[PDB]
Design a protein around this ligand. Structure first.
Ligand SMILES: *[C@@H]1O[C@H](CO)[C@@H](O[C@@H]2O[C@H](CO)[C@@H](O)[C@H](O)[C@H]2NC(C)=O)[C@H](O)[C@H]1NC(C)=O
Ligand SMILES: *[C@@H]1O[C@H](CO)[C@@H](O[C@@H]2O[C@H](CO)[C@@H](O)[C@H](O)[C@H]2NC(C)=O)[C@H](O)[C@H]1NC(C)=O
Ligand SMILES: *[C@@H]1O[C@H](CO)[C@@H](O[C@@H]2O[C@H](CO)[C@@H](O)[C@H](O)[C@H]2NC(C)=O)[C@H](O)[C@H]1NC(C)=O
Ligand SMILES: *[C@@H]1O[C@H](CO)[C@@H](O[C@@H]2O[C@H](CO)[C@@H](O)[C@H](O)[C@H]2NC(C)=O)[C@H](O)[C@H]1NC(C)=O
Ligand SMILES: *[C@@H]1O[C@H](CO)[C@@H](O)[C@H](O)[C@H]1NC(C)=O
Ligand SMILES: *[C@@H]1O[C@H](CO)[C@@H](O)[C@H](O)[C@H]1NC(C)=O
Ligand SMILES: *[C@@H]1O[C@H](CO)[C@@H](O)[C@H](O)[C@H]1NC(C)=O
Ligand SMILES: *[C@@H]1O[C@H](CO)[C@@H](O)[C@H](O)[C@H]1NC(C)=O
Ligand SMILES: *[C@@H]1O[C@H](CO)[C@@H](O)[C@H](O)[C@H]1NC(C)=O
Ligand SMILES: *[C@@H]1O[C@H](CO)[C@@H](O)[C@H](O)[C@H]1NC(C)=O
Lengths: 231, 299, 237
């Protein structure tokens, strides 16, 4: 039923996208509103196939009480496998009451994992970190008495692959009529070649700028003694 | 459309990459420390008043007054919540743009971290920097009285400690007044938070343009597929459907390219913010004009 | 020792603990190879570039089998089955589709190149600042107090090994801001006043090393009626 106040000379109703959303019945002069049928998106949560074949399903943006469907398969709900999150409806996972580090992100602060409890798939609220509380006083201090030497690693990309493309071979192959037809489409391929050449030059420039700081080739002494440090 | 290749797979891949990168940016900015510190129950720090930035337990969200003002200042359109199909079907005769976007395959996903977790992270950082100084950013947290930390910072900028120890009350009063003026300065200025509003405006404008693009003809006889199907002979309808398909594909590609460029810019901004958080909050910086104007003390 | 002086520790701390520091460094270096080998996804950033390039090239090759609304995806079939003035309307569709695919590939490559250039600039700055010198920026050359770094080369990238100093085994103490003596206030030159319960010493920052309070490591510069929390004791000469 429609609450819109159609004027007597009007027969249709349109929206922003210019599609019909209100109609007037030809036989009884009554206004009706048209809405699309229910729909939504589906996501599948799984561990590796090397581990197990169990899965969980997430219906995005769908209230858990509104679940002939387009996908033929159906995952049937039991008493405990249904959960509702601010990201949608989750089926096939049990909501535990503990907190762990996030393993598979789901939505607003909810993560999923594969746990032995019989192995199963569980859902939980991610934990930010360990609780701590430092004692504060206005006449007390803490001072260290020992030290530790630590070594850590950091990885950074520098350059990538340099590629080149031939237009005539890719588009037309060996055909002559195709090449003649392509000849009148402008100079797109010159621009493509220029861009690829620029990228190729920039890669070498990046590597040179990173790795060529010094212009002297120093050598280590033949005797490797540095006060007990092993290099 | 099935015989036009795999453009849509590429579009989905690009959008998924952007979505993951957003969460990565937030995590890298706001998750520096892995310990949740708490402030002592007794709030006395040598005359320094931190009530305007510490969490307020009275309100349910546990936000500081300044954070409350900031969250009230910026207006958000869609938060990624459940804009349920039940809400859109309500037919209140007031059709908003969100329902029109949803009815055409455009959706918004919620962020991984909620506002409460970000507030908790900020509170932990504040408690650590108030009760330990810069020690907790390099190892175990070591207790120290606040005025001694302030004197150490003055020694860092090149002033002896007796200058602070003989002017403690004046410095505390100046700091309190400067903190108090911040809320008034933020509230009075109407366009203070323009950078944050620009992102929302850009996203809304892009989505609205994408939705509006569906009413173009692109040289066909109509913009509605049903009319073409019902008015035209079946082998003659493809020449009209193809034009619409090509136009809509071009619109989608333009939208995706714009989104990619904006994502790159946002990533650069997030990297700068993470560097500033590491260098101005967890320590004292000697770089000129990097953590304010003047000689840096703390942040 | 000069680097320890740089981070704020005296040289005798190193000169009296040379063997322990050397052993700790050797063990830390030895653990690196095991840590790298055991972790399966340690070098994911470098593998991502190769995966992206291979995927893009494979998609570009696979795109050649589309029809784009024509009767066939093979030019020879169209040429051999169709009248010459009628073959252009079919060839044009294929040409346009392939041009669109090429343009999409080029745009993606340009964006990825910009990102890689930003990463390379960051790597060059890190090499200049953490390897050729000692950095005071927090969390720029590792976690802790920076000492030095070593570079290594990797396929399409660089790896930095950062050596840092971390305090441990802390203890509580009672502290005061100034010491009162003969109606005069004394402040430490470098370090902090510390009390073990009965006596008062002056120590340095990141290592516990008590010393007898003397006029040699303090300056007076004031009176004893304005400092809050002052504690009076004896100062020797
Ligand atoms: C500071 O820490 C180091 C390493 O933890 C301590 O060295 C250890 O001392 C114990 C007790 O003598 C030995 O059993 C270990 O073999 C030592 N480890 C190494 C690597 O040499 C050192 O004793 C600590 N300093 C103090 C003052 O206790
Ligand atoms: C520096 O460390 C390396 C590796 O830990 C030492 O090489 C080992 O030497 C012992 C005795 O010669 C051998 O049994 C091991 O097989 C060697 N390991 C490797 C991986 O080759 C080296 O000796 C150390 N440097 C010094 C001066 O002792
Ligand atoms: C820190 O500053 C706040 C705000 O300036 C003070 O809170 C005020 O306290 C007075 C007296 O209790 C009240 O009349 C005001 O209404 C309060 N203002 C607000 C905004 O709540 C607070 O007292 C200060 N801290 C201390 C220890 O005095
Ligand atoms: C605090 O440190 C002082 C200085 O070392 C300690 O005083 C010494 O205590 C030892 C142990 O009995 C005596 O042999 C020395 O003669 C004392 N020094 C002087 C100058 O008399 C004091 O015992 C320490 N306090 C605590 C609680 O450990
Ligand atoms: C159409 O005919 C039906 C049945 O004869 C009748 O109920 C209805 O009122 C008619 N409507 C009009 C507009 O004549
Ligand atoms: C889901 O449906 C139930 C059924 O009444 C309702 O109470 C609840 O509010 C709905 N949830 C949302 C998010 O609309
Ligand atoms: C989870 O733990 C909270 C902590 O108090 C408790 O209140 C709640 O009842 C628990 N839920 C279940 C299902 O055990
Ligand atoms: C800080 O000093 C005040 C003196 O006004 C004292 O009341 C308070 O107990 C001190 N703080 C602690 C933790 O003892
Ligand atoms: C210092 O004292 C506090 C309170 O008594 C305690 O929490 C802390 O563990 C102590 N520090 C050490 C190193 O024992
Ligand atoms: C030294 O300190 C004590 C404790 O506060 C105080 O009673 C005494 O008067 C001080 N000495 C002098 C000379 O003022």
């Amino acid at each position: 039923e429609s609450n819109k106040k159609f004027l007597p000379f009007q027969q249709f109703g349109r929206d922003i996208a210019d599609t019909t959303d209100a109609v007037r019945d030809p036989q009884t002069l009554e206004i009706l509103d048209i809405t699309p049928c229910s729909f939504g998106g589906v996501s599948v949560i799984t561990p590796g196939t090397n581990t197990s074949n169990q899965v969980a399903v997430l219906y995005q943006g769908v209230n858990c009480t509104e679940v002939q469907l387009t996908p033929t398969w159906r995952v049937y709900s039991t008493g405990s496998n249904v959960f509702q999150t601010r990201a949608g409806c989750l089926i096939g996972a049990e909501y535990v009451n503990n907190s762990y580090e996030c393993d598979i992100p789901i939505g607003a602060g909810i993560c999923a994992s594969y746990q032995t409890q019989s192995q199963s798939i569980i859902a939980y609220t991610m934990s930010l970190g360990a609780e701590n509380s430092v004692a504060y006083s206005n006449n007390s201090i803490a001072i260290p008495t020992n030290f530790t030497i630590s070594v850590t690693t950091e990885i950074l990309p520098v350059s990538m692959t340099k590629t080149s493309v031939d237009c005539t071979m890719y588009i037309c192959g060996d055909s002559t009529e195709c090449s003649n037809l392509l000849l009148q489409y402008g100079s797109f391929c010159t621009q493509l070649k220029r861009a690829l050449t620029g990228i190729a030059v920039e890669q070498d420039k990046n590597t040179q700028e990173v790795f060529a700081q010094v212009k002297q080739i120093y050598k280590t002494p033949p005797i490797k003694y540095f006060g007990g440090f092993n290099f | 459309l099935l015989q036009y290749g795999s453009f849509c797979t590429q579009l989905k891949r690009a959008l998924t990459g952007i979505a993951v990168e957003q969460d990565k940016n937030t995590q890298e900015v706001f998750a520096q420390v892995k310990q949740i510190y708490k402030t002592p129950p007794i709030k006395y720090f040598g005359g320094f008043n931190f009530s305007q930035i510490l969490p307020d337990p009275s309100k349910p969200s546990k936000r500081s007054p300044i954070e409350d003002l900031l969250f009230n200042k910026v207006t958000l359109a869609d938060a990624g919540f459940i804009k349920q199909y039940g809400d859109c079907l309500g037919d209140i005769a007031a059709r908003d743009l969100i329902c029109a976007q949803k009815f055409n395959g455009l959706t918004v996903l919620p962020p991984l971290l909620t506002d409460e977790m970000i507030a908790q992270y900020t509170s932990a950082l504040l408690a650590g920097t108030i009760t330990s100084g810069w020690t907790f950013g390099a190892g175990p947290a070591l207790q120290i009285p606040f005025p001694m930390q302030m004197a150490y910072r003055f020694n860092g900028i090149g002033v002896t400690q007796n200058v602070l120890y003989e002017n403690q009350k004046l410095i505390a009063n100046q700091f309190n007044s400067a903190i108090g003026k911040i809320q008034d300065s933020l509230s009075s200025t109407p366009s203070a938070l323009g950078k944050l509003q620009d992102v929302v405006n850009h996203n809304a404008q892009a989505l609205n343009t994408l939705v509006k693009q569906l009413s173009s003809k692109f040289g066909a006889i109509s913009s509605v597929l049903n009319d073409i199907l019902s008015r035209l002979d079946p082998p003659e309808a493809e020449v009209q459907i193809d034009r619409l398909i090509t136009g809509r594909l071009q619109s989608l590609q333009t939208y995706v390219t714009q989104q990619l460029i904006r994502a790159a810019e946002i990533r650069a901004s997030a990297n700068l913010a993470a560097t500033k958080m590491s260098e101005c909050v967890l320590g004292q910086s000697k770089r000129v004009d990097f953590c304010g104007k003047g000689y840096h003390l703390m942040s | 020792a000069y680097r320890f002086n740089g981070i704020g520790v005296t040289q005798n701390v190193l000169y009296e603990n040379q063997k322990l520091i050397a052993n700790q460094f050797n063990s830390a270096i030895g653990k690196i190879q095991d840590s790298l080998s055991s972790t399966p996804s340690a070098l994911g950033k470098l593998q991502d570039v190769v995966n992206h390039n291979a995927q893009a090239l494979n998609t570009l090759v696979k795109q050649l089998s589309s029809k784009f609304g024509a009767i066939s995806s093979v030019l020879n079939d169209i040429l051999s089955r169709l009248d010459p003035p009628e073959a252009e309307v079919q060839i044009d569709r294929l040409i346009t589709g392939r041009l669109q695919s090429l343009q999409t590939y080029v745009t993606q490559q340009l964006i990825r190149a910009a990102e890689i250039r930003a990463s390379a600039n960051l790597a060059a700055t890190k090499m200049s600042e953490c390897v050729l010198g000692q950095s005071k920026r927090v969390d720029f050359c590792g976690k802790g107090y920076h000492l030095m770094s070593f570079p290594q080369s990797a396929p399409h990238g660089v790896v930095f090994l950062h050596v840092t100093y971390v305090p441990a085994q802390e203890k509580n103490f009672t502290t005061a801001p100034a010491i009162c003596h003969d109606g005069k206030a004394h402040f430490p030159r470098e370090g902090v006043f510390v009390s073990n319960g009965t006596h008062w010493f002056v120590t340095q920052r990141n290592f516990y090393e008590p010393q007898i309070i003397t006029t040699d490591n303090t300056f007076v510069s004031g009176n004893c009626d304005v400092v809050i929390g002052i504690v009076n004791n004896t100062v020797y000469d």
